Design a protein around this ligand. Structure first.
Ligand SMILES: CCCCCCCCCCCCCCCC(=O)O
Ligand SMILES: CCCCCCCCCCCCCCCC(=O)O
Length: 129
Protein backbone atom coordinates (compact mmCIF):
# COMPACT_ATOMS: atom_id res chain seq x y z
CA UNK A 1 0.00 0.00 0.00
CA UNK A 2 3.18 2.15 -0.18
CA UNK A 3 1.87 4.34 -3.06
CA UNK A 4 -1.78 4.68 -1.86
CA UNK A 5 -3.44 8.02 -1.13
CA UNK A 6 -4.81 11.31 -2.35
CA UNK A 7 -2.67 13.92 -4.09
CA UNK A 8 -3.11 17.27 -5.83
CA UNK A 9 -0.89 18.72 -8.53
CA UNK A 10 1.16 21.62 -7.15
CA UNK A 11 3.07 22.62 -10.31
CA UNK A 12 3.76 21.33 -13.85
CA UNK A 13 6.35 22.03 -16.61
CA UNK A 14 5.65 21.84 -20.33
CA UNK A 15 1.95 21.00 -20.08
CA UNK A 16 0.99 22.87 -23.28
CA UNK A 17 3.87 21.77 -25.49
CA UNK A 18 3.38 18.15 -24.41
CA UNK A 19 -0.41 18.06 -24.83
CA UNK A 20 -0.14 19.61 -28.31
CA UNK A 21 2.36 16.90 -29.21
CA UNK A 22 0.19 13.97 -28.04
CA UNK A 23 -2.86 15.49 -29.78
CA UNK A 24 -4.98 16.84 -26.92
CA UNK A 25 -7.75 19.10 -28.35
CA UNK A 26 -6.78 22.78 -28.02
CA UNK A 27 -9.90 23.43 -25.89
CA UNK A 28 -9.07 20.92 -23.17
CA UNK A 29 -5.52 22.26 -23.28
CA UNK A 30 -6.61 25.87 -22.56
CA UNK A 31 -9.03 24.93 -19.80
CA UNK A 32 -6.91 22.15 -18.26
CA UNK A 33 -3.61 24.08 -18.15
CA UNK A 34 -4.17 25.80 -14.76
CA UNK A 35 -6.21 22.99 -13.17
CA UNK A 36 -4.51 21.51 -10.17
CA UNK A 37 -5.77 17.99 -10.78
CA UNK A 38 -6.35 15.22 -8.21
CA UNK A 39 -4.91 11.71 -8.41
CA UNK A 40 -6.11 8.96 -6.07
CA UNK A 41 -4.08 5.73 -5.93
CA UNK A 42 -5.05 2.44 -4.30
CA UNK A 43 -2.23 -0.16 -4.05
CA UNK A 44 -2.62 -3.78 -2.90
CA UNK A 45 0.74 -5.52 -3.32
CA UNK A 46 1.39 -5.61 -7.08
CA UNK A 47 -2.15 -4.53 -7.94
CA UNK A 48 -2.85 -0.81 -8.46
CA UNK A 49 -5.92 1.29 -9.17
CA UNK A 50 -5.54 4.99 -9.91
CA UNK A 51 -7.92 7.85 -10.72
CA UNK A 52 -6.95 11.17 -12.31
CA UNK A 53 -9.57 13.87 -11.92
CA UNK A 54 -9.40 17.26 -13.56
CA UNK A 55 -12.76 18.97 -13.05
CA UNK A 56 -15.29 16.69 -14.76
CA UNK A 57 -12.61 14.66 -16.56
CA UNK A 58 -12.27 11.44 -14.62
CA UNK A 59 -9.80 8.83 -15.84
CA UNK A 60 -9.93 5.50 -14.06
CA UNK A 61 -7.02 3.07 -14.65
CA UNK A 62 -5.76 -0.28 -13.37
CA UNK A 63 -2.58 -2.39 -13.54
CA UNK A 64 -0.70 -5.21 -11.82
CA UNK A 65 3.04 -4.73 -11.65
CA UNK A 66 4.70 -7.05 -14.15
CA UNK A 67 1.51 -7.86 -16.09
CA UNK A 68 -0.08 -6.56 -19.27
CA UNK A 69 -2.48 -3.66 -18.74
CA UNK A 70 -4.50 -1.30 -20.90
CA UNK A 71 -3.92 2.31 -19.94
CA UNK A 72 -6.38 5.03 -20.87
CA UNK A 73 -4.33 8.02 -21.78
CA UNK A 74 -5.24 11.69 -21.75
CA UNK A 75 -6.71 11.66 -25.31
CA UNK A 76 -8.89 8.59 -24.55
CA UNK A 77 -6.49 6.28 -26.40
CA UNK A 78 -6.03 2.95 -24.61
CA UNK A 79 -2.66 1.27 -25.03
CA UNK A 80 -1.44 -2.13 -23.98
CA UNK A 81 1.81 -2.02 -22.01
CA UNK A 82 3.40 -3.13 -18.71
CA UNK A 83 4.11 -1.16 -15.53
CA UNK A 84 7.28 -2.10 -13.59
CA UNK A 85 8.76 -1.09 -10.21
CA UNK A 86 12.13 0.64 -10.23
CA UNK A 87 13.80 0.81 -6.82
CA UNK A 88 11.43 1.01 -3.86
CA UNK A 89 9.64 4.22 -4.97
CA UNK A 90 9.26 4.27 -8.76
CA UNK A 91 6.58 3.09 -11.13
CA UNK A 92 7.96 2.91 -14.65
CA UNK A 93 6.25 2.35 -18.02
CA UNK A 94 6.18 3.18 -21.71
CA UNK A 95 3.08 3.78 -23.82
CA UNK A 96 2.88 5.27 -27.35
CA UNK A 97 6.59 6.28 -27.22
CA UNK A 98 6.07 8.31 -24.04
CA UNK A 99 8.43 7.29 -21.22
CA UNK A 100 6.79 7.63 -17.82
CA UNK A 101 8.43 7.70 -14.41
CA UNK A 102 6.28 7.97 -11.26
CA UNK A 103 8.32 8.70 -8.19
CA UNK A 104 7.11 8.85 -4.61
CA UNK A 105 9.17 10.45 -1.87
CA UNK A 106 7.23 10.61 1.42
CA UNK A 107 4.18 12.75 0.54
CA UNK A 108 5.40 14.14 -2.80
CA UNK A 109 4.63 12.33 -6.07
CA UNK A 110 6.78 13.35 -9.04
CA UNK A 111 5.57 12.31 -12.50
CA UNK A 112 7.72 12.87 -15.58
CA UNK A 113 6.60 11.94 -19.08
CA UNK A 114 9.14 12.25 -21.88
CA UNK A 115 8.19 12.15 -25.55
CA UNK A 116 11.29 12.69 -27.67
CA UNK A 117 12.91 15.89 -26.35
CA UNK A 118 9.69 17.00 -24.57
CA UNK A 119 9.67 16.46 -20.80
CA UNK A 120 6.30 16.81 -19.04
CA UNK A 121 6.84 17.05 -15.29
CA UNK A 122 4.19 17.24 -12.58
CA UNK A 123 4.78 17.69 -8.86
CA UNK A 124 1.96 16.64 -6.48
CA UNK A 125 1.54 16.70 -2.72
CA UNK A 126 -0.59 14.52 -0.40
CA UNK A 127 -3.96 16.09 0.55
CA UNK A 128 -5.36 14.03 3.39
CA UNK A 129 -6.89 10.60 3.01
C1 LIG B 1 -13.16 20.10 -17.48
C2 LIG B 1 -12.23 19.09 -18.14
C3 LIG B 1 -10.83 19.17 -17.54
C4 LIG B 1 -9.82 19.84 -18.47
C5 LIG B 1 -9.21 18.87 -19.46
C6 LIG B 1 -8.22 17.90 -18.83
C7 LIG B 1 -6.87 18.04 -19.52
C8 LIG B 1 -5.76 17.31 -18.76
C9 LIG B 1 -5.25 18.04 -17.53
C10 LIG B 1 -3.95 17.40 -17.04
C11 LIG B 1 -4.20 16.04 -16.39
C12 LIG B 1 -2.90 15.31 -16.08
C13 LIG B 1 -2.53 14.28 -17.12
C14 LIG B 1 -1.26 13.54 -16.74
C15 LIG B 1 -1.43 12.88 -15.38
C16 LIG B 1 -0.78 11.53 -15.40
O1 LIG B 1 -1.18 10.67 -16.20
O2 LIG B 1 0.17 11.26 -14.62
C1 LIG C 1 -1.91 9.33 -18.78
C2 LIG C 1 -1.65 7.85 -19.05
C3 LIG C 1 -1.44 7.08 -17.75
C4 LIG C 1 -0.12 7.48 -17.09
C5 LIG C 1 0.71 6.26 -16.73
C6 LIG C 1 0.84 6.10 -15.22
C7 LIG C 1 0.87 4.63 -14.82
C8 LIG C 1 1.59 4.37 -13.49
C9 LIG C 1 1.43 5.49 -12.46
C10 LIG C 1 0.15 5.40 -11.63
C11 LIG C 1 0.04 6.51 -10.58
C12 LIG C 1 0.11 7.90 -11.23
C13 LIG C 1 0.40 9.01 -10.21
C14 LIG C 1 1.02 10.26 -10.84
C15 LIG C 1 0.65 11.50 -10.05
C16 LIG C 1 0.16 12.58 -10.98
O1 LIG C 1 -1.04 12.63 -11.33
O2 LIG C 1 0.94 13.45 -11.40
Amino acid sequence: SSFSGKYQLQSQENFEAFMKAIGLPEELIQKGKDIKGVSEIVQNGKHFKFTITAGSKVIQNEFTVGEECELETMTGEKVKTVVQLEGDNKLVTTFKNIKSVTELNGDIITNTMTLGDIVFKRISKRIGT
